[PDB]
Amino acid sequence: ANRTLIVTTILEEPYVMYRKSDKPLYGNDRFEGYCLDLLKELSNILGFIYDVKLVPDGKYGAQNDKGEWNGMVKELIDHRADLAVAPLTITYVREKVIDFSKPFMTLGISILYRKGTPIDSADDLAKQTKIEYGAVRDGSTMTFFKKSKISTYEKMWAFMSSRQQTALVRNSDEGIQRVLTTDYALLMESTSIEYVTQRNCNLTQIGGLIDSKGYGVGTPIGSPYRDKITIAILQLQEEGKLHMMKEKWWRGNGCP
């Protein structure tokens, strides 16, 4: 039989979540969400079974000064996993070191905050000095700011970096808790802002999208699966299945 593929992933609602049960769950059955449905579809098309493993360091992946990667990106570079199936952003820096599939979803960075402020854009956010802001540590949003040559975003990076110990949060849940309980705005991908703001009516998006990009399945460079995964994603795209999956996991609208 075909070797069981190792899938690296990360907990992120509604992509990958713990299933709630009153009885024991083991292996892949512990997880549910958009990315688990995606895996069920992809595996049917490609002819494999798989083993879902949460990334040990709990990170998406960024490179340090020495050029060393961490998170799911490192798992792929080091051939610890066959595929990364997660809300994993397709970026220039990552594409040089792993092989991404074509995108299964598009999104852009925007701002998550509470309601009631006059802040209406990243320019407003960077200029004012009343509320702090940051991003999840070692993801693509952090890297977007780290790499930017746009003045507003360079300032925002300098600010985030100066207060990194505090401004850069471990995960999105810590980020949202910080937004809810302190004067802190979270830089977050728009599809995640969409999800949270239809559930917690105290939260809102600030401004529009500051970029545009996609999520893709990651594989190690040279992977014999990437092209087959791309073909399968295009099939799911054209058949309307990706759209159906988004509707299933984001349903519905709960806030004014």
Ligand SMILES: N[C@@H](C[C@]1(C(=O)O)C[C@H]2OC[C@@H](O)[C@H](O)[C@H]2O1)C(=O)O
């Ligand atoms: N997709 C990113 C990870 C992350 C981000 O950096 O925004 C981290 C986490 O942040 C919240 C929201 O943007 C989304 O659920 C997640 O995106 C990546 O591939 O590095």
